[PDB]
Scaffold this motif. Structure first.
Motif, PDB file in Angstrom:
ATOM      1  N   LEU A  36      61.905  37.980  21.726  1.00  0.00           N
ATOM      2  CA  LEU A  36      60.517  38.038  21.279  1.00  0.00           C
ATOM      3  C   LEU A  36      59.926  39.427  21.485  1.00  0.00           C
ATOM      4  N   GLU A  37      60.289  40.089  22.580  1.00  0.00           N
ATOM      5  CA  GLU A  37      59.711  41.373  22.937  1.00  0.00           C
ATOM      6  C   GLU A  37      60.545  42.525  22.383  1.00  0.00           C
ATOM      7  N   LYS A  38      59.948  43.712  22.400  1.00  0.00           N
ATOM      8  CA  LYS A  38      60.627  44.939  22.019  1.00  0.00           C
ATOM      9  C   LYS A  38      61.286  45.576  23.242  1.00  0.00           C
ATOM     10  N   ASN A  39      62.118  46.589  22.982  1.00  0.00           N
ATOM     11  CA  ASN A  39      62.806  47.345  24.033  1.00  0.00           C
ATOM     12  C   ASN A  39      63.621  46.431  24.944  1.00  0.00           C
ATOM     13  N   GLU A  40      64.304  45.462  24.350  1.00  0.00           N
ATOM     14  CA  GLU A  40      65.121  44.522  25.099  1.00  0.00           C
ATOM     15  C   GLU A  40      66.595  44.863  24.931  1.00  0.00           C
ATOM     16  N   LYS A  41      67.372  44.574  25.973  1.00  0.00           N
ATOM     17  CA  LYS A  41      68.793  44.891  25.993  1.00  0.00           C
ATOM     18  C   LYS A  41      69.491  43.939  26.954  1.00  0.00           C
ATOM     19  N   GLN A  42      70.689  43.495  26.577  1.00  0.00           N
ATOM     20  CA  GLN A  42      71.434  42.556  27.406  1.00  0.00           C
ATOM     21  C   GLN A  42      71.901  43.228  28.692  1.00  0.00           C
ATOM     22  N   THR A  43      71.684  42.553  29.823  1.00  0.00           N
ATOM     23  CA  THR A  43      72.156  43.032  31.114  1.00  0.00           C
ATOM     24  C   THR A  43      73.260  42.176  31.715  1.00  0.00           C
ATOM     25  N   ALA A  44      73.415  40.933  31.267  1.00  0.00           N
ATOM     26  CA  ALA A  44      74.457  40.060  31.787  1.00  0.00           C
ATOM     27  C   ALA A  44      74.749  38.973  30.764  1.00  0.00           C
ATOM     28  N   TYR A  45      75.977  38.458  30.804  1.00  0.00           N
ATOM     29  CA  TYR A  45      76.388  37.369  29.930  1.00  0.00           C
ATOM     30  C   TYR A  45      77.280  36.407  30.704  1.00  0.00           C
ATOM     31  N   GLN A  46      77.448  35.213  30.145  1.00  0.00           N
ATOM     32  CA  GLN A  46      78.361  34.219  30.699  1.00  0.00           C
ATOM     33  C   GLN A  46      78.812  33.308  29.570  1.00  0.00           C
ATOM     34  N   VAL A  47      80.119  33.242  29.337  1.00  0.00           N
ATOM     35  CA  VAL A  47      80.690  32.402  28.292  1.00  0.00           C
ATOM     36  C   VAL A  47      81.531  31.321  28.953  1.00  0.00           C
ATOM     37  N   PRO A 829      67.991  46.360  16.383  1.00  0.00           N
ATOM     38  CA  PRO A 829      68.225  45.042  16.981  1.00  0.00           C
ATOM     39  C   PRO A 829      68.246  45.129  18.501  1.00  0.00           C
ATOM     40  N   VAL A 830      68.269  43.952  19.127  1.00  0.00           N
ATOM     41  CA  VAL A 830      68.284  43.878  20.583  1.00  0.00           C
ATOM     42  C   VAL A 830      69.634  44.373  21.115  1.00  0.00           C
ATOM     43  N   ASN A 831      69.603  44.977  22.310  1.00  0.00           N
ATOM     44  CA  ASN A 831      70.763  45.631  22.934  1.00  0.00           C
ATOM     45  C   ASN A 831      71.158  46.899  22.176  1.00  0.00           C
ATOM     46  N   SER A 832      70.162  47.625  21.676  1.00  0.00           N
ATOM     47  CA  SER A 832      70.395  48.887  20.989  1.00  0.00           C
ATOM     48  C   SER A 832      69.148  49.749  21.120  1.00  0.00           C
ATOM     49  N   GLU A 833      69.342  51.061  21.015  1.00  0.00           N
ATOM     50  CA  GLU A 833      68.249  52.016  21.100  1.00  0.00           C
ATOM     51  C   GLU A 833      68.254  52.911  19.870  1.00  0.00           C
ATOM     52  N   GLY A 834      67.064  53.359  19.482  1.00  0.00           N
ATOM     53  CA  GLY A 834      66.883  54.173  18.295  1.00  0.00           C
ATOM     54  C   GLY A 834      66.445  55.579  18.650  1.00  0.00           C
ATOM     55  N   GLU A 835      66.914  56.548  17.866  1.00  0.00           N
ATOM     56  CA  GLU A 835      66.562  57.958  18.031  1.00  0.00           C
ATOM     57  C   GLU A 835      66.081  58.462  16.672  1.00  0.00           C
ATOM     58  N   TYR A 867      62.918  69.014  13.623  1.00  0.00           N
ATOM     59  CA  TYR A 867      62.626  67.590  13.636  1.00  0.00           C
ATOM     60  C   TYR A 867      61.617  67.269  14.734  1.00  0.00           C
ATOM     61  N   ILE A 868      61.077  66.055  14.664  1.00  0.00           N
ATOM     62  CA  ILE A 868      60.278  65.467  15.733  1.00  0.00           C
ATOM     63  C   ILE A 868      61.044  64.255  16.245  1.00  0.00           C
ATOM     64  N   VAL A 869      61.374  64.265  17.531  1.00  0.00           N
ATOM     65  CA  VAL A 869      62.256  63.261  18.117  1.00  0.00           C
ATOM     66  C   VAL A 869      61.422  62.144  18.726  1.00  0.00           C
ATOM     67  N   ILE A 870      61.723  60.908  18.334  1.00  0.00           N
ATOM     68  CA  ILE A 870      61.088  59.714  18.877  1.00  0.00           C
ATOM     69  C   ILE A 870      62.187  58.767  19.336  1.00  0.00           C
ATOM     70  N   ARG A 871      62.062  58.264  20.560  1.00  0.00           N
ATOM     71  CA  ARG A 871      63.033  57.346  21.143  1.00  0.00           C
ATOM     72  C   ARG A 871      62.385  55.977  21.283  1.00  0.00           C
ATOM     73  N   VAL A 872      62.993  54.966  20.662  1.00  0.00           N
ATOM     74  CA  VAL A 872      62.477  53.604  20.674  1.00  0.00           C
ATOM     75  C   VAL A 872      63.599  52.653  21.070  1.00  0.00           C
ATOM     76  N   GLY A 873      63.215  51.412  21.360  1.00  0.00           N
ATOM     77  CA  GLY A 873      64.175  50.362  21.638  1.00  0.00           C
ATOM     78  C   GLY A 873      64.276  49.374  20.495  1.00  0.00           C
ATOM     79  N   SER A 874      64.524  48.106  20.811  1.00  0.00           N
ATOM     80  CA  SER A 874      64.649  47.091  19.774  1.00  0.00           C
ATOM     81  C   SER A 874      63.292  46.788  19.144  1.00  0.00           C
ATOM     82  N   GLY A 875      63.319  46.450  17.859  1.00  0.00           N
ATOM     83  CA  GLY A 875      62.133  46.080  17.114  1.00  0.00           C
ATOM     84  C   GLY A 875      61.985  46.893  15.846  1.00  0.00           C
ATOM     85  N   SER A 876      60.893  46.623  15.134  1.00  0.00           N
ATOM     86  CA  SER A 876      60.556  47.316  13.900  1.00  0.00           C
ATOM     87  C   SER A 876      59.385  48.259  14.139  1.00  0.00           C
TER      88      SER A 876
END
Length: 883
Positions: A36-47, A829-835, A867-876
């Motif tokens: 639901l939120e922005k700037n999210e990234k997976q920190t742990a998993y369990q299968v 998308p989530v678990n990714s960062e944008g530059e 260029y002008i550099v902007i660093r973002v996380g997940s989201g639009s």
């Protein structure tokens, strides 16, 4: 319980939704994330992997339970209990977001194991004993080869069922091609099965689910064999068959039917069948009712034992060949009486379906296919060369009949039919598009329509050259898996289609053809033995593997083939005792106005790929933790550069007037030019492009893949755009202006025999430039862990968008350029960062993150004077550079 309300979705085993026939003891698991939120990234998993549905619904690790694994990776290698054949497993997965908030379990997925590494196959290879064939020896075969075309044998076996079934499975490997029937119904959703491999080293079998096909009392199975690539010319035998039919009852008991001498066999309607020359279907010799329970199974000869093909029988999970679309003709004319020609408006691959109404039996209908046409309206079969590419159907006279070939395919745009019972229409012909059914991975659209047409031609050309193996052309007597064409177009196919399952199978094919000294064949599978390989060709082993890690984050494919990389680089070191690989066969293949390079750059291209193979291997070694191998190759790479420059760097340019474009883009790509010479070498390239050639390519297949990125990296994207926008010779626009719906083998318009094919993919690497530069989305870190949104609004471009479905989810870039506002909309998308790299096209500007102003003066954000550099996380996000 938490704010992490979304469980992982799109769960794939072996990069496939619910795979059937997993033979890998340690398959690969993957999943996508949404928050639901922005700037999210997976920190742990369990299968959790379990052996039953009731069992998995209790959150217990019946055969695997990783627990809370502290890792951001979403592509895992299986490490649970040793899997067993013919068993169905279930698996769910949870993920922890950036705040350690636990997510609910995913929906239970499923993967079923096949026979599992030839686990006592019990079934034996069966064949006819007579085997009628024809030996076609046309004048002008590639290397003087001949074509031994056998007939199409059918195999039948009857079995009985009483107790009600629980499930049914069928594990068949019909060489070289097959079609399976059970109680009269066709089984597979695929065609031209199985895939083309070195049948002496490996045979890929297919497993089908035939549960709801078993019926009660008497049962019947049907298998018809085609030749395909299992032919005597490539060192194989006549068609053979192996098949075992697992049947499980509700009482947890099992029985199965295997292939043996109790099988009956006969010849049917299909006579000769060949991938190059077509298929003949005689409807008069059609055994009516041959694959149904109540049928006189006698009067047939019994099958005999076959010598096995010699290869291990494996089951790889990869996209099969299918009928992906049905197209209808657009125009029809008659250049000669009784001859009717159809035009489909597009050069594609596959076959056609004809509808006939004759009532009279024994009438022959001949279907020819071609890529080009003549001025008088008749077909030009020159690009097909010695490949006949004609299908023949003899009618039965039942008032209405339909026919499609089953053991061949052609590459064509036009179709000629002779012998039709009357005048045919546009409904009586149905084109079948046939190739490896890959999914769509990315879209791209431009403000420039010529670029869109070039992009449209590459999409059809790549699919036209995906027949379980990456081929060079799909129309003539070749269609081999040339390593060079597959390497240069691998980046384009990844951007456009889901290729990780396809390349994993092809990477095995290269492994199955690697010689003991580390050598590789120029075509894989090595139906044509060309050893050793050109360095620009054999580089496809490490390059395609590195692509799978760069664009999908699959480091496991790097470890699985690492020894093969070390062995091939060892062989290249043998050819380079003093570091300059003088051996080359192709080099910069097909420069404008030539076939062999005109600049004598083969030894430069070869050393270019020697440094390339060693540098990326040292990069792979450091990734896997091999410090000794890392340092060693790193040191050796330095040897090459310095030896590359000592032999080729000439004061102001590279050589061996006296300098070509190919001779300069290659050392500038891998940055082999000394820092005190880059400005002068790059200028020689620009002057050769602008002055000597007026914004036109003077490069073959190798240097065309690098020239656009070289000019873009050094701040000259306007020159690259002016090259693409050309509509004159030599350019991609010149192909479109001359009626090309795909890409040509040569820059020059050539419509005769010889290397003049009109559906090649080697020059298709420019489509990757449209995604990464024009649109502006490139990989910043492997697996799309970091995305670089750097648009390049050059020329008269007004808008451009690339939307990709990667291993991490949806990636999108959009930009609009007006006189005042430069818009940009990205999606991470989530678990990714944008530059974001907003280009500074205005002396003063604003830069707005939607309605929020984020740059009033210098220092509000990062910048590098361009260029002008902007660093973002997940989201639009929506960015607005105004004024």
């Amino acid at each position: 319980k938490s704010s992490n309300i979304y469980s992982p979705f799109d769960l794939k085993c072996e990069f496939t939704t619910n795979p059937l026939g997993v033979d890998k003891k340690n398959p690969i698991f993957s999943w996508k994330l949404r928050h639901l939120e922005k700037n999210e990234k997976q920190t742990a998993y369990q299968v959790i992997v379990s052996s039953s549905l009731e069992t998995i619904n209790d959150n217990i690790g019946d055969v695997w339970d990783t627990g809370k694994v502290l890792s951001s990776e979403q592509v895992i290698k299986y490490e649970g209990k040793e899997l067993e054949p013919c068993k169905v497993y279930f698996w769910k997965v949870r993920w922890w977001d950036s705040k350690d908030q636990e997510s609910p379990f995913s929906v239970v997925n499923t993967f079923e194991t096949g026979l599992m590494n030839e686990e006592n196959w019990k079934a034996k290879w069966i064949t006819k004993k007579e085997h009628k064939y024809e030996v076609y020896s046309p004048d002008g075969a590639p290397f003087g080869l001949n074509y031994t075309i056998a007939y199409a044998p059918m195999f039948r076996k009857s079995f009985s069922i009483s107790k009600k079934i629980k499930r049914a499975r069928v594990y068949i490997a019909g060489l070289g091609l097959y079609e399976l029937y059970i109680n009269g119904e066709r089984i597979g959703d695929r065609v031209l099965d199985p895939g083309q491999t070195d049948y002496k080293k490996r045979v890929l079998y297919t497993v089908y689910d035939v549960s709801k096909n078993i019926r009660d009392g008497k049962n019947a199975i049907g298998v018809i064999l085609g030749n395909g690539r299992y032919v005597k010319e490539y060192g194989y035998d006549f068609p053979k068959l192996i098949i075992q039919v697992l049947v499980e009852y509700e009482d947890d008991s099992i029985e199965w039917i295997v292939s043996d001498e109790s099988w009956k066999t006969t010849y049917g309607p299909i006579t000769l069948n060949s991938l190059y020359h077509g298929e003949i279907y005689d409807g008069r010799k059609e055994i009516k009712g041959w694959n149904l329970p109540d049928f006189d199974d006698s009067t047939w000869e019994n099958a005999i034992l076959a010598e096995p093909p010699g290869g291990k029988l494996y089951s790889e999970i990869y996209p099969p060949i299918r009928i992906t679309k049905t197209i209808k003709p657009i125009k029809m004319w008659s250049p000669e009486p009784g001859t009717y020609v159809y035009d489909f408006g597009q050069n594609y691959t596959g076959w056609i379906k004809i509808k006939v109404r004759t009532n009279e039996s024994g009438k022959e209908i001949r279907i020819r296919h071609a890529e080009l046409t003549y001025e008088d309206g008749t077909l030009n079969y020159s690009t097909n060369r010695t490949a006949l590419a004609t299908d023949v159907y003899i009618t039965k006279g039942e008032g209405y009949e339909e026919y499609e070939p089953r053991f061949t395919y052609h590459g064509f745009r036009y179709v000629e039919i002779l012998g039709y019972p009357g005048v045919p229409t546009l409904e009586d012909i149905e084109g079948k598009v046939v190739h490896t059914a890959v999914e769509s991975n990315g879209e791209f659209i431009c403000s420039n329509e010529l670029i869109n047409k070039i992009h449209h031609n590459i999409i059809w050309g790549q699919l036209s050259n995906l027949m379980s193996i990456p081929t060079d052309c799909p129309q003539r007597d070749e269609r081999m898996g040339w390593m060079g064409d597959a390497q240069l177009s691998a980046e384009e196919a990844i951007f456009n289609f889901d290729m990780i399952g396809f390349y994993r199978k092809y990477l095995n094919d290269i492994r199955d053809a690697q010689k003991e000294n580390g050598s590789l064949s120029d075509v894989i599978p090595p139906y044509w033995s060309i050893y050793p390989g050109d360095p620009a060709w054999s580089t496809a082993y490490i390059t395609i593997a590195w692509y799978l890690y760069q664009y999908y984050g699959d480091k496991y494919v790097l470890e699985e083939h690492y020894e093969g990389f070390k062995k091939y680089v060892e062989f290249l070191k043998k050819l380079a005792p003093d570091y300059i690989v003088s051996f080359y066969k192709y080099g910069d293949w097909c420069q404008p106005g030539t076939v062999r390079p005109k600049d004598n750059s083969g030894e430069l291209t070869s050393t270019f790929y020697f440094y390339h193979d060693v540098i990326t291997l040292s990069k792979i070694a450091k990734l896997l933790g091999k410090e000794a191998d890392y340092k060693y190759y790193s040191e050796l790479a330095d040897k090459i550069k310095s030896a590359f420059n000592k032999k080729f760097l000439k004061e102001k340019a590279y050589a061996s007037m006296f300098t070509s474009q190919t001779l300069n883009t290659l050392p500038l790509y891998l940055n082999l030019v000394p820092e005190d010479k880059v400005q002068d070498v790059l200028k020689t390239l620009l002057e050769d492009i602008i002055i000597r050639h007026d914004y036109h390519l003077d490069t073959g297949i190798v240097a065309t893949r690098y020239i656009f990125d070289v000019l873009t990296s050094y701040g000259y994207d306007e020159v690259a755009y002016k090259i693409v926008n050309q509509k004159t010779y030599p350019s991609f626009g010149y192909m479109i202006e001359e009626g090309a719906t795909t890409l040509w083998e040569r820059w020059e318009k050539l419509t005769s025999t010889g290397m003049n094919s009109h559906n090649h993919i080697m020059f298709g690497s420019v489509d990757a430039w449209f995604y990464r530069v024009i649109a502006g989305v490139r990989v910043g870190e492997p697996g799309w862990n970091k995305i670089i949104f750097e648009p390049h609004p050059v020329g008269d471009l007004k808008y451009a968008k690339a939307r990709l479905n990667t291993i991490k989810g949806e990636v999108e870039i959009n930009w609009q350029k007006t006189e005042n506002i430069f818009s940009m909309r990205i999606s991470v998308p989530v678990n990714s960062e944008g530059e974001v790299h907003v280009p500074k096209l205005f002396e003063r500007f604003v830069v707005k993150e939607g309605d929020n102003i984020i740059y009033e003066k210098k220092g509000d954000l990062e910048e590098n004077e361009k260029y002008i550099v902007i660093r973002v996380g997940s989201g639009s996000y929506n960015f607005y550079m105004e004024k």
